[PDB]
Design an enzyme around this catalytic site. Structure first.
Site, PDB file in Angstrom:
ATOM      1  N   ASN A 102       0.794  -1.206   0.000  1.00 40.79           N
ATOM      2  CA  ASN A 102       0.000   0.000   0.000  1.00 40.79           C
ATOM      3  C   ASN A 102       0.848   1.289   0.000  1.00 40.79           C
ATOM      4  N   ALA A 182      -4.475  10.791  -9.237  1.00 40.36           N
ATOM      5  CA  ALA A 182      -5.760  10.728  -8.535  1.00 40.36           C
ATOM      6  C   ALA A 182      -5.696   9.579  -7.571  1.00 40.36           C
ATOM      7  N   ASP A 184      -6.506   6.165  -6.078  1.00 40.31           N
ATOM      8  CA  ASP A 184      -6.849   4.965  -6.813  1.00 40.31           C
ATOM      9  C   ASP A 184      -8.341   4.575  -6.574  1.00 40.31           C
ATOM     10  N   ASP A 195      -8.003   5.282  -0.251  1.00 44.11           N
ATOM     11  CA  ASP A 195      -6.752   4.899  -0.838  1.00 44.11           C
ATOM     12  C   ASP A 195      -5.624   5.292   0.111  1.00 44.11           C
ATOM     13  N   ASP A 201       1.726   6.964  -0.118  1.00 39.27           N
ATOM     14  CA  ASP A 201       0.757   6.032  -0.695  1.00 39.27           C
ATOM     15  C   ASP A 201       1.130   5.655  -2.119  1.00 39.27           C
ATOM     16  N   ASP A 203       0.978   4.709  -5.893  1.00 41.73           N
ATOM     17  CA  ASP A 203       0.032   4.933  -6.969  1.00 41.73           C
ATOM     18  C   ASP A 203      -0.140   3.703  -7.821  1.00 41.73           C
ATOM     19  N   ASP A 205      -2.116   3.224 -10.201  1.00 41.60           N
ATOM     20  CA  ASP A 205      -2.484   3.577 -11.568  1.00 41.60           C
ATOM     21  C   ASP A 205      -1.191   3.657 -12.366  1.00 41.60           C
ATOM     22  N   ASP A 232      -1.836  -7.253   3.246  1.00 40.16           N
ATOM     23  CA  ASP A 232      -2.116  -6.218   4.205  1.00 40.16           C
ATOM     24  C   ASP A 232      -2.887  -5.078   3.555  1.00 40.16           C
ATOM     25  N   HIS A 236      -7.326  -0.370   0.945  1.00 38.72           N
ATOM     26  CA  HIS A 236      -6.630   0.862   0.570  1.00 38.72           C
ATOM     27  C   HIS A 236      -5.863   0.691  -0.697  1.00 38.72           C
ATOM     28  N   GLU A 262      -6.385  -8.907   4.371  1.00 38.27           N
ATOM     29  CA  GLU A 262      -6.895  -8.236   5.533  1.00 38.27           C
ATOM     30  C   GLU A 262      -7.703  -7.067   5.065  1.00 38.27           C
TER      31      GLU A 262
HETATM   32  C1  LIG Z   1      -4.237  -1.018  11.700  1.00 37.94           C
HETATM   33  C2  LIG Z   1      -5.250  -0.920  10.570  1.00 37.94           C
HETATM   34  O1  LIG Z   1      -5.487   0.439  10.159  1.00 37.94           O
HETATM   35  C3  LIG Z   1      -6.644   0.550   9.302  1.00 37.94           C
HETATM   36  O2  LIG Z   1      -7.803   0.262   9.944  1.00 37.94           O
HETATM   37  C4  LIG Z   1      -8.878   1.191  10.151  1.00 37.94           C
HETATM   38  C5  LIG Z   1      -9.231   1.319  11.649  1.00 37.94           C
HETATM   39  C6  LIG Z   1      -8.093   1.879  12.523  1.00 37.94           C
HETATM   40  O3  LIG Z   1      -7.806   3.176  12.063  1.00 37.94           O
HETATM   41  O4  LIG Z   1     -10.387   2.123  11.882  1.00 37.94           O
HETATM   42  C7  LIG Z   1     -11.539   1.654  11.200  1.00 37.94           C
HETATM   43  O5  LIG Z   1     -11.880   0.386  11.510  1.00 37.94           O
HETATM   44  C8  LIG Z   1     -13.094   0.154  12.239  1.00 37.94           C
HETATM   45  C9  LIG Z   1     -12.853  -0.399  13.646  1.00 37.94           C
HETATM   46  C10 LIG Z   1     -11.860   0.469  14.430  1.00 37.94           C
HETATM   47  O6  LIG Z   1     -12.497   1.359  15.357  1.00 37.94           O
HETATM   48  O7  LIG Z   1     -14.115  -0.572  14.331  1.00 37.94           O
HETATM   49  C11 LIG Z   1     -14.989  -1.476  13.624  1.00 37.94           C
HETATM   50  O8  LIG Z   1     -16.190  -1.697  14.385  1.00 37.94           O
HETATM   51  C12 LIG Z   1     -15.266  -0.904  12.229  1.00 37.94           C
HETATM   52  O9  LIG Z   1     -16.182  -1.635  11.416  1.00 37.94           O
HETATM   53  C13 LIG Z   1     -13.935  -0.861  11.499  1.00 37.94           C
HETATM   54  O10 LIG Z   1     -14.093  -0.488  10.119  1.00 37.94           O
HETATM   55  C14 LIG Z   1     -11.275   1.706   9.691  1.00 37.94           C
HETATM   56  O11 LIG Z   1     -12.425   1.245   9.031  1.00 37.94           O
HETATM   57  C15 LIG Z   1     -10.130   0.747   9.390  1.00 37.94           C
HETATM   58  O12 LIG Z   1      -9.957   0.575   7.993  1.00 37.94           O
HETATM   59  C16 LIG Z   1      -6.402  -0.337   8.065  1.00 37.94           C
HETATM   60  O13 LIG Z   1      -7.554  -0.447   7.242  1.00 37.94           O
HETATM   61  C17 LIG Z   1      -5.999  -1.769   8.418  1.00 37.94           C
HETATM   62  O14 LIG Z   1      -5.762  -2.529   7.221  1.00 37.94           O
HETATM   63  C18 LIG Z   1      -4.781  -1.699   9.339  1.00 37.94           C
HETATM   64  N1  LIG Z   1      -4.100  -2.988   9.631  1.00 37.94           N
HETATM   65  C19 LIG Z   1      -3.007  -3.460   8.719  1.00 37.94           C
HETATM   66  C20 LIG Z   1      -2.326  -2.288   8.033  1.00 37.94           C
HETATM   67  C21 LIG Z   1      -1.101  -1.876   8.404  1.00 37.94           C
HETATM   68  C22 LIG Z   1      -0.350  -1.043   7.404  1.00 37.94           C
HETATM   69  O15 LIG Z   1       0.589  -0.192   8.080  1.00 37.94           O
HETATM   70  C23 LIG Z   1      -0.480  -2.238   9.750  1.00 37.94           C
HETATM   71  O16 LIG Z   1      -0.499  -1.150  10.679  1.00 37.94           O
HETATM   72  C24 LIG Z   1       0.121  -1.085  11.857  1.00 37.94           C
HETATM   73  O17 LIG Z   1       1.427  -0.680  11.454  1.00 37.94           O
HETATM   74  C25 LIG Z   1       1.488   0.692  11.097  1.00 37.94           C
HETATM   75  C26 LIG Z   1       2.848   1.000  10.492  1.00 37.94           C
HETATM   76  O18 LIG Z   1       3.763   0.903  11.537  1.00 37.94           O
HETATM   77  C27 LIG Z   1       1.127   1.587  12.304  1.00 37.94           C
HETATM   78  O19 LIG Z   1       1.190   2.912  11.838  1.00 37.94           O
HETATM   79  C28 LIG Z   1       1.064   3.916  12.840  1.00 37.94           C
HETATM   80  O20 LIG Z   1       2.348   4.408  13.116  1.00 37.94           O
HETATM   81  C29 LIG Z   1       3.009   4.846  11.918  1.00 37.94           C
HETATM   82  C30 LIG Z   1       4.474   5.117  12.216  1.00 37.94           C
HETATM   83  O21 LIG Z   1       4.503   6.319  12.926  1.00 37.94           O
HETATM   84  C31 LIG Z   1       2.299   6.088  11.356  1.00 37.94           C
HETATM   85  O22 LIG Z   1       2.980   6.690  10.260  1.00 37.94           O
HETATM   86  C32 LIG Z   1       2.837   8.134  10.378  1.00 37.94           C
HETATM   87  O23 LIG Z   1       3.943   8.753  11.009  1.00 37.94           O
HETATM   88  C33 LIG Z   1       5.140   8.787  10.262  1.00 37.94           C
HETATM   89  C34 LIG Z   1       6.131   9.641  11.039  1.00 37.94           C
HETATM   90  O24 LIG Z   1       6.358   9.037  12.309  1.00 37.94           O
HETATM   91  C35 LIG Z   1       4.984   9.412   8.879  1.00 37.94           C
HETATM   92  O25 LIG Z   1       6.189   9.192   8.145  1.00 37.94           O
HETATM   93  C36 LIG Z   1       6.621  10.171   7.350  1.00 37.94           C
HETATM   94  O26 LIG Z   1       7.311  11.246   8.023  1.00 37.94           O
HETATM   95  C37 LIG Z   1       8.538  10.810   8.624  1.00 37.94           C
HETATM   96  C38 LIG Z   1       9.125  11.976   9.404  1.00 37.94           C
HETATM   97  C39 LIG Z   1       9.506  10.240   7.582  1.00 37.94           C
HETATM   98  N2  LIG Z   1      10.771   9.799   8.180  1.00 37.94           N
HETATM   99  C40 LIG Z   1      12.020  10.480   7.839  1.00 37.94           C
HETATM  100  C41 LIG Z   1      12.655  11.123   9.050  1.00 37.94           C
HETATM  101  C42 LIG Z   1      13.750  10.658   9.699  1.00 37.94           C
HETATM  102  C43 LIG Z   1      14.275  11.408  10.902  1.00 37.94           C
HETATM  103  O27 LIG Z   1      14.413  12.800  10.555  1.00 37.94           O
HETATM  104  C44 LIG Z   1      14.500   9.430   9.272  1.00 37.94           C
HETATM  105  O28 LIG Z   1      14.810   8.640  10.435  1.00 37.94           O
HETATM  106  C45 LIG Z   1      13.662   8.648   8.268  1.00 37.94           C
HETATM  107  O29 LIG Z   1      14.502   7.702   7.624  1.00 37.94           O
HETATM  108  C46 LIG Z   1      13.078   9.573   7.205  1.00 37.94           C
HETATM  109  O30 LIG Z   1      12.525   8.816   6.119  1.00 37.94           O
HETATM  110  C47 LIG Z   1       8.812   9.129   6.788  1.00 37.94           C
HETATM  111  O31 LIG Z   1       9.625   8.655   5.706  1.00 37.94           O
HETATM  112  C48 LIG Z   1       7.503   9.651   6.209  1.00 37.94           C
HETATM  113  O32 LIG Z   1       6.850   8.666   5.380  1.00 37.94           O
HETATM  114  C49 LIG Z   1       3.794   8.804   8.141  1.00 37.94           C
HETATM  115  O33 LIG Z   1       3.550   9.497   6.933  1.00 37.94           O
HETATM  116  C50 LIG Z   1       2.552   8.809   9.029  1.00 37.94           C
HETATM  117  O34 LIG Z   1       1.500   8.139   8.365  1.00 37.94           O
HETATM  118  C51 LIG Z   1       0.878   5.637  10.985  1.00 37.94           C
HETATM  119  O35 LIG Z   1       0.109   6.691  10.447  1.00 37.94           O
HETATM  120  C52 LIG Z   1       0.226   5.055  12.248  1.00 37.94           C
HETATM  121  O36 LIG Z   1      -1.060   4.622  11.889  1.00 37.94           O
HETATM  122  C53 LIG Z   1      -0.295   1.199  12.749  1.00 37.94           C
HETATM  123  O37 LIG Z   1      -0.760   1.964  13.849  1.00 37.94           O
HETATM  124  C54 LIG Z   1      -0.267  -0.283  13.099  1.00 37.94           C
HETATM  125  O38 LIG Z   1      -1.511  -0.728  13.582  1.00 37.94           O
HETATM  126  C55 LIG Z   1      -1.291  -3.322  10.436  1.00 37.94           C
HETATM  127  O39 LIG Z   1      -0.488  -3.987  11.404  1.00 37.94           O
HETATM  128  C56 LIG Z   1      -1.812  -4.218   9.336  1.00 37.94           C
HETATM  129  O40 LIG Z   1      -2.078  -5.551   9.793  1.00 37.94           O
HETATM  130 CA   LIG Z   2      -3.467   3.196  -0.949  1.00 33.62          CA
HETATM  131 CA   LIG Z   3      -3.475   6.939  -8.280  1.00 31.33          CA
HETATM  132 NA    NA Z   4      -2.789   5.100  -4.364  1.00 32.76          NA
END
Ligand SMILES: [C]=C1O[C](O[C]2[C]([C][O])O[C](O[C]3[C]([C][O])O[C]([O])[C]([O])[C]3[O])[C]([O])[C]2[O])[C]([O])[C]([O])[C]1[N][C]1[C]=C([C]=O)/C(=O/[C]2O[C]([C][O])[C](O[C]3O[C]([C][O])[C](O[C]4O[C]([C][O])[C](O[C]5OC(=[C])[C]([N][C]6[C]=C([C]=O)C(=O)[C]([O])[C]6[O])[C]([O])[C]5[O])[C]([O])[C]4[O])[C]([O])[C]3[O])[C]([O])[C]2[O])[C]([O])[C]1[O]
Ligand SMILES: [Ca+2]
Ligand SMILES: [Ca+2]
Ligand code: NA
Ligand SMILES: OC[C@H]1O[C@H](O[C@H]2[C@H](O)[C@@H](O)[C@@H](O)O[C@@H]2CO)[C@H](O)[C@@H](O)[C@@H]1O
Ligand SMILES: OC[C@H]1O[C@H](O)[C@H](O)[C@@H](O)[C@@H]1O
Ligand SMILES: OC[C@H]1O[C@H](O)[C@H](O)[C@@H](O)[C@@H]1O
Ligand SMILES: [Ca+2]
Length: 481
Positions: A102, A182, A184, A195, A201, A203, A205, A232, A236, A262
């Site tokens: 992510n 933008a 996702d 996202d 985060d 990208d 795309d 994980d 998002h 998850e």
């Molecule tokens: C856990 C989870 O989350 C989510 O979920 C959610 C919840 C809670 O919020 O809410 C809700 O749900 C609900 C419930 C509750 O209440 O109830 C029921 O009934 C209902 O139905 C439901 O729905 C919502 O809805 C939800 O969604 C999500 O989704 C999930 O999936 C999760 N789980 C999973 C995932 C993951 C991924 O990550 C994981 O987690 C964990 O781990 C983490 C990581 O570690 C944590 O986180 C925390 O802490 C962190 C660390 O601190 C944070 O980050 C922040 O801050 C930082 C600072 O510190 C920042 O960074 C930045 O800036 C800095 C300054 C830099 N660095 C620099 C500097 C220096 C010195 O000068 C050097 O050394 C170095 O080399 C450089 O580079 C960096 O780079 C940057 O980047 C950032 O940006 C910020 O962001 C965060 O925020 C926090 O959060 C957590 O806590 C944990 O838990 C887990 O495990 C998995 O399995």
């Molecule tokens: Ca994302």
């Molecule tokens: Ca995007």
């Molecule tokens: Na994204």
């Protein structure tokens, strides 16, 4: 034979670099207990040595390169890891690797990026003019160089961040400007668009990013000889990315690659939508059941035990549910803290382990304890239930979810597991008894409680029925003596 996985970590394991070694050494014991798959924590370099792993700094550093102040990860070095996997695999235990795609944290340097602030409660609502922020998006992986991968991450691989190093405001989410930038879609629509979670985060795309993560996913599976994944933060990550990444990795490796995502929402409808959009090609954790168990355990006996499976993935889509009692997010003090009360834990484990639905997971924290909080090891109480699952939980199931305290089910056993068959009965309230059918063919057998909670025996009547008993706030699991 019944599949059982164990999440082999908790949030508060010590940062001693000894975890892979402990896992290696436990491999034989795990197989003996009936564990067939082990879900291992993030194996790569996080934002520091003590990072549980979800800080995801360098997915190609499996405790191998000197980065972020350390060679090893929290859990140990790459060779200690491979030797744990070897030991597990030599004991016929599959290994599922956690996968965190992510975001990336712990960037080597900042970049001046044109960005706009959006509303953290509605990431589709822009709440500033565009302006330049200092974002932590430059990854050059100095300690690794180009070993394994020469991909370098830059701002344009990310959709946003929540931290402007130049101004340092909390509760900000910054969406990057740029052509085609933008959030996702589709992702979870909580907060309008979920996202963005943390750090930088990714990208999804970006075609370079999709290709890199696909290739990394092959590399990771191949380098570690993985059997599957725990993905994980899927709410998002663009759902079609995950769907296709998994398909890519399975096609590239020719492996099944069992995967469980998850998707943390206590909402079957959202989970089902995710399953629909990922074309049912992997499983989800049964987060609803987890909350059912957590709520039941907090209800002092007043939960209607007949409804325990209501609203859950395992009730509705048993083949796509990984059932669990707790995990490292729900354990005490953690982000989703909702830890099932101790007295109820054995009932919870019996529910996930002795029923035919779901792929159950045992939590390391439950089994071995969480010393940092005051959670004793429940191994002694889980062991008899794992034993039930391994040797007795086979065959047709008959449920008796028909009372607000005392529920039960039985399993008729089957021909491929000698002496298999059981009757699980539990009460969240006063003890009691229930007539339940274990199979006409079991007539005359003398059954005992493999958990030892109820001394004594029960003899199966001419018709395959018996009046099984349980103590108050307890589970008993009766099996052929
Ligand atoms: C856990 C989870 O989350 C989510 O979920 C959610 C919840 C809670 O919020 O809410 C809700 O749900 C609900 C419930 C509750 O209440 O109830 C029921 O009934 C209902 O139905 C439901 O729905 C919502 O809805 C939800 O969604 C999500 O989704 C999930 O999936 C999760 N789980 C999973 C995932 C993951 C991924 O990550 C994981 O987690 C964990 O781990 C983490 C990581 O570690 C944590 O986180 C925390 O802490 C962190 C660390 O601190 C944070 O980050 C922040 O801050 C930082 C600072 O510190 C920042 O960074 C930045 O800036 C800095 C300054 C830099 N660095 C620099 C500097 C220096 C010195 O000068 C050097 O050394 C170095 O080399 C450089 O580079 C960096 O780079 C940057 O980047 C950032 O940006 C910020 O962001 C965060 O925020 C926090 O959060 C957590 O806590 C944990 O838990 C887990 O495990 C998995 O399995
Ligand atoms: Ca994302
Ligand atoms: Ca995007
Ligand atoms: Na994204
Ligand atoms: O142990 C017998 C007793 O167990 C259960 O009671 C729970 C109680 O519901 C919880 O609130 C928790 O705090 O502690 C007790 C277990 O120590 C049953 O609910 C109760 O009927 C039964 O007698
Ligand atoms: O029955 C649910 C689950 O049980 C176990 C199987 O290995 C897994 O693939 C399946 O999805
Ligand atoms: O006698 C109690 C039990 O015995 C057997 C019966 O077929 C079943 O229906 C009943 O509940
Ligand atoms: Ca009750």
């Amino acid at each position: 034979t019944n599949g059982t996985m164990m999440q082999y970590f908790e949030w508060h394991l010590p940062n001693d670099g000894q975890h892979w070694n402990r896992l290696r050494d436990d491999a034989s014991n795990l197989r003996n207990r009936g564990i067939t798959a082990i879900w291992i924590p993030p194996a790569w370099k996080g934002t520091s040595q003590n990072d549980v792993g979800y800080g995801a700094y360098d997915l190609y550093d499996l405790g191998e390169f000197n980065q972020k102040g350390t060679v090893r990860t929290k859990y140990g070095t790459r060779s200690q890891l491979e030797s744990a996997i070897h030991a597990l695999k030599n004991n016929g235990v599959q290994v599922y690797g956690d996968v965190v795609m992510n975001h990336k944290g712990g960037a080597d340097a900042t970049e001046n990026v044109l960005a706009v602030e959006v509303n953290p409660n509605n990431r589709n609502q822009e709440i500033s003019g565009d302006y330049t922020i200092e974002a932590w998006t430059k990854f050059d992986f100095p300690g690794r160089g180009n070993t394994y991968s020469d991909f370098k991450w830059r701002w344009y691989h990310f959709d946003g961040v929540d931290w402007d190093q130049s101004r340092q405001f909390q509760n900000r989410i910054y969406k990057f400007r740029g052509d085609g930038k933008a959030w996702d879609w589709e992702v979870d629509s909580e907060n309008g668009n979920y996202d963005y979670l943390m750090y930088a985060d990714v990208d999804m795309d970006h075609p370079e990013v999709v290709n890199e993560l696909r290739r990394w996913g092959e590399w990771y599976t191949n380098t570690l000889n993985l059997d599957g994944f725990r993905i994980d933060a899927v709410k998002h990550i663009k759902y079609s990315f995950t769907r296709d990444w998994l398909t890519h990795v399975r096609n590239a490796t020719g492996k099944e690659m069992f995967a469980v995502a998850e998707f943390w929402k206590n909402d079957l409808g959202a989970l089902e939508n995710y399953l629909n959009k990922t074309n049912w090609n992997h499983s989800v954790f049964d987060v609803p059941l987890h909350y059912n168990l957590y709520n039941a355990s907090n209800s002092g006996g007043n939960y209607d035990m007949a409804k325990l499976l209501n609203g859950t993935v395992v009730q509705k889509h048993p083949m796509h549910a990984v059932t669990f009692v707790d995990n490292h997010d729900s354990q005490p003090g953690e982000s989703l803290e909702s830890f099932v009360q101790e007295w109820f834990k054995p009932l919870a484990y019996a529910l996930i382990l002795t029923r035919e639905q779901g792929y159950p997971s045992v939590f390391y924290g439950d089994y071995y304890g969480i010393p940092t909080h005051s959670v004793p090891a429940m191994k002694a109480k889980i062991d008899p239930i794992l034993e039930a699952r391994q040797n007795f939980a086979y065959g047709t199931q008959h449920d008796y979810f028909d009372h607000h305290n005392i529920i039960g089910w039985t399993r008729e056993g089957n021909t491929t597991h000698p002496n298999s068959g059981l009757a699980t009965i539990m009460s969240d309230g006063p003890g009691g008894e229930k007539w339940m059918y274990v199979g006409q063919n079991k007539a005359g057998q003398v059954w005992h409680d493999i958990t030892g909670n109820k001394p004594g025996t029960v003899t199966i009547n001419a018709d395959g029925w018996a009046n099984f008993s349980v103590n108050g706030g307890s589970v008993s699991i009766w099996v052929k003596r």
